[PDB]
């Protein structure tokens, strides 16, 4: 019943899954650890050593599946990796999100961290999808993490090239392949941003709890060539969906040059805590406090500002807050900058507002910054884009990725 091949033992009755072409995965043991064990044809009929070596160079990162050993003795080779709780697919399909909190977001973050590690090593993955993202068993503190796996299509690029030929292997998995991998008329070679495209689809798949930007399975790939995507799950007037839409629409752009790099994605407010959101608002208002209203920065900030502040943002805050501004008023209700100014001031003087004002805002910082983003769902997304003019400044390094 149990099979043994060196330090690797496994029972063939416990099949965890498949890969393709006689690829099979069993539950097993190596050393004294719980592993999953993928069985692959020998190197004669696999040509998998180059890609196992890439797994070797990458697996140090916590969000790249840890790889333990391979053994060759039999007809086959056996690759032992860390035994995991679920694929991301199973997680999205089988698990009640009501009770999970920010956990799905952090799995997206951890996946992006792992992908940024790969790209930093000049490795492109080329086959990212929920089935390929593993979820760890709980650690001693009951925490879990996502890990990139499945290196069968990974390529290391030479140091002078930032692209590879698209005729250079299987395109990937239907439904998750960047359009430049398949499109007929395409004068530009694929790059790292095929992973960002696939990642963008995974993001929506998670936060939509199982839907896909380009439709149901049978039209996905076709809609990808046509660029007919849809993010229906993202309400256009909820702060969190607004922020998520703004990132995902960039990750899945038809133009690969418009897609954010993984390090940019890691910086996006999609991943910011409330505390970090409020701190961004404060740093912005400090930055522009003595900027000319005619200057580039403020001008950029105010374009389209009326929709963001809802014409008169003073008629869109609770009354106890309205009366606290009038004490020393003079606030323009159409100015984004003056909305941020008010926020900065009430934050800075928070330990002094009247009780009813402190209670209408909520606790500093979590409830406080939600008082505003919930009332002006476009404010942060608007401010993030406008303030890219200062992304090169030491002040704004926590918020943007720059060289
Ligand atoms: O990175 S590789 O491609 C390195 C490589 C590079 C080039 C050529 C070949 C290999 N190897 C590589 C890989 F992708 C995936 C592997 O495993 C799997 N495959 C398919 C489906 C699931 C798993 C798996 C893995 C770990 N835990 C669990 N737990 C279960 C999850 N769901 C419910 C419960 F069943 C518990 N399921 C695997 F074992 C590998 F070795």
UniProtKB/Swiss-Prot annotation:
Catalytic-site annotation from UniProt: 127
Cytoplasmic side, ranges: 1-403
Expression by tissue: Ubiquitously expressed. High levels observed in pancreatic tissue.
Effect of residue 269 to L: In an ovarian serous carcinoma sample; somatic mutation
Residue ranges of domain Protein kinase in the record: 10-271
Region named Interacts with hydroxy-aryl-aldehyde inhibitors: 345-346
Subcellular location: Endoplasmic reticulum membrane
One GO CC annotation: nuclear inner membrane
PTM field: Autophosphorylated following homodimerization. Autophosphorylation promotes activation of the endoribonuclease domain. In response to ER stress, phosphorylated at Ser-163, Ser-168 and possibly Ser-165; phosphorylation promotes oligomerization and endoribonuclease activity. Dephosphorylated at Ser-163, Ser-168 and possibly Ser-165 by RPAP2 to abort failed ER-stress adaptation and trigger apoptosis. Phosphorylated at Ser-163; in response to the ER stressor tunicamycin. ADP-ribosylated by PARP16 upon ER stress, which increases both kinase and endonuclease activities.
GO biological process: cellular response to glucose stimulus; cellular response to hydrogen peroxide; cellular response to unfolded protein; cellular response to vascular endothelial growth factor stimulus; endothelial cell proliferation; insulin metabolic process; intrinsic apoptotic signaling pathway in response to endoplasmic reticulum stress; IRE1-mediated unfolded protein response
A single GO molecular function term of this UniProt record: magnesium ion binding
UniProt keywords, alphabetically: ADP-ribosylation, Apoptosis, ATP-binding, Disulfide bond, Endoplasmic reticulum, Glycoprotein, Hydrolase, Kinase, Magnesium, Membrane, Metal-binding, Multifunctional enzyme, Nucleotide-binding, Phosphoprotein, Serine/threonine-protein kinase, Signal, Transcription, Transcription regulation, Transferase, Transmembrane, Transmembrane helix, Unfolded protein response
Binding site for ATP: 16-24, 38, 82-84, 129-132, 150
UniProt site positions, description: Interacts with hydroxy-aryl-aldehyde inhibitors: 331
Positions of modified residues (Phosphoserine): 163, 168
Induction summary: Induced by the ER stressor tunicamycin.
UniProt domain KEN: residue ranges: 274-402
Function: Serine/threonine-protein kinase and endoribonuclease that acts as a key sensor for the endoplasmic reticulum unfolded protein response (UPR). In unstressed cells, the endoplasmic reticulum luminal domain is maintained in its inactive monomeric state by binding to the endoplasmic reticulum chaperone HSPA5/BiP. Accumulation of misfolded proteins in the endoplasmic reticulum causes release of HSPA5/BiP, allowing the luminal domain to homodimerize, promoting autophosphorylation of the kinase domain and subsequent activation of the endoribonuclease activity.
Record text on subunit structure and interactions: Monomer. Homodimer; disulfide-linked; homodimerization takes place in response to endoplasmic reticulum stress and promotes activation of the kinase and endoribonuclease activities. Dimer formation is driven by hydrophobic interactions within the N-terminal luminal domains and stabilized by disulfide bridges. Interacts (via the luminal region) with DNAJB9/ERdj4; interaction takes place in unstressed cells and promotes recruitment of HSPA5/BiP.
Family named by the database record: Belongs to the protein kinase superfamily. Ser/Thr protein kinase family.
Protein name per the record: Serine/threonine-protein kinase/endoribonuclease IRE1
Lineage, uppermost ranks: Eukaryota, Metazoa, Chordata, Craniata, Vertebrata
Gene this chain is encoded by: ERN1
Included range, full protein: 562 to 964 of 977
């Amino acid at each position: 019943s149990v099979v043994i091949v060196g330090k690797i033992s496994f029972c063939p009755k416990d099949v965890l899954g498949h890969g393709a072409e006689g690829t099979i995965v069993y539950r097993g043991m190596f050393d004294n650890r719980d592993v999953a064990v993928k069985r692959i044809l020998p190197e004669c009929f696999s040509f998998a050593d180059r890609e196992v070596q890439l797994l070797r160079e990458s697996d140090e990162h916590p969000n790249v599946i840890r790889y333990f050993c391979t053994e060759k003795d039999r007809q086959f080779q056996y690759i032992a990796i860390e035994l995991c709780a679920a694929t991301l697919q199973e997680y999205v399909e089988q698990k009640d999100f009501a009770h999970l909190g920010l956990e799905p977001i952090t799995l997206l973050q951890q996946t992006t961290s792992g992908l940024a590690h790969l790209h930093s090593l000049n490795i492109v993955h080329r086959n990212l999808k929920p089935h390929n993202i593993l979820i760890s068993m709980p650690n001693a503190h009951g925490k879990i993490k996502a890990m990139i796996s499945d290196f069968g299509l990974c390529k290391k690029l030479a140091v002078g090239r930032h692209s590879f030929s698209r005729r250079s292997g299987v395109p990937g998995t239907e439904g998750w392949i960047a359009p430049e991998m398949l499109s007929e008329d395409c004068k530009e070679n694929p790059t790292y941003t095929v992973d960002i495209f696939s990642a963008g689809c995974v993001f929506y798949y998670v936060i939509s709890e199982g839907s896909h930007p380009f439709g149901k399975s049978l039209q996905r790939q076709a809609n990808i060539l046509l660029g007919a995507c849809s993010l229906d799950c993202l309400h256009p007037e909820k702060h969190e969906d607004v922020i998520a839409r703004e990132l995902i629409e960039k990750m899945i752009a038809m133009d690969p040059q418009k897609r954010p790099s993984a390090k940019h994605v890691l910086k996006h407010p999609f991943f910011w805590s409330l505390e970090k959101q409020l701190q961004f608002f404060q740093d912005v208002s400090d930055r522009i406090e003595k900027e000319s209203l005619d200057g580039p920065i403020v001008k950029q900030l105010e374009r389209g500002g009326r929709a963001v502040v809802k014409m008169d943002w003073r008629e869109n805050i609770t009354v106890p807050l309205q009366t606290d501004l009038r004490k020393f008023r003079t606030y323009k209700g159409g100015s984004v900058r003056d909305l941020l100014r008010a926020m900065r001031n009430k934050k800075h003087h928070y330990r002094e507002l009247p009780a009813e004002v402190r209670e209408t805002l909520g606790s500093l910082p979590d409830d406080f910054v939600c008082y505003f983003t919930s009332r002006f769902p476009h404010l942060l997304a608007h401010t993030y884009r406008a303030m890219e003019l200062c992304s090169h400044e030491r002040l704004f390094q926590p918020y943007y990725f720059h060289e």
